[PDB]
Amino acid sequence: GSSGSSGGEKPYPCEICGTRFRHLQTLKSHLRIHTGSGPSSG
Ligand SMILES: [Zn+2]
């Protein structure tokens, strides 16, 4: 259906893949594995 908040667990769905995260601040860090071509971020 619609995309956005959920209202329970991981109301902050990822933008790259989609994997949600209990908290937002956390998700932002989950984007590190998504973007990072080279010696940066691994
Ligand atoms: Zn993701």
Name the helix (H) or strand (E) containing 26. helix 24-30
CA dihedral (34, 5, 1, 30) in degrees, to 10, reads 10
How many A from CA of 9 to the centre of ligand 1? 16
Domain presence at residue 4 = no
How many A from CA of 22 to the centre of ligand 1? 13
Residue 21 in contact with residue 27, Cβ under 8 Å?
A: yes
CA gap 38, 40 in Å, rounded? 5
- Please state the length of the chain: 42
| Domain total in the chain | 1
How many A from CA of 33 to the centre of ligand 1? 8
How many A from CA of 17 to the centre of ligand 1? 4
Task: Kindly state the DSSP code that residue 34 receives in the 8-state scheme.
Answer: T
Residue 34 in contact with residue 16, Cβ under 8 Å?
A: yes
Domain presence at residue 5 = no
- The residue to which tokens 């590190």 are assigned: 32
Alpha-carbon torsion (35, 40, 28, 19), positive or negative:
positive
* Residue 22 structural domain: 10-42
- The residue to which tokens 């994997």 are assigned: 19
Nearest alpha-carbon partner for 24 in 41, 10, 40 = 10
How many A from CA of 19 to the centre of ligand 1? 5
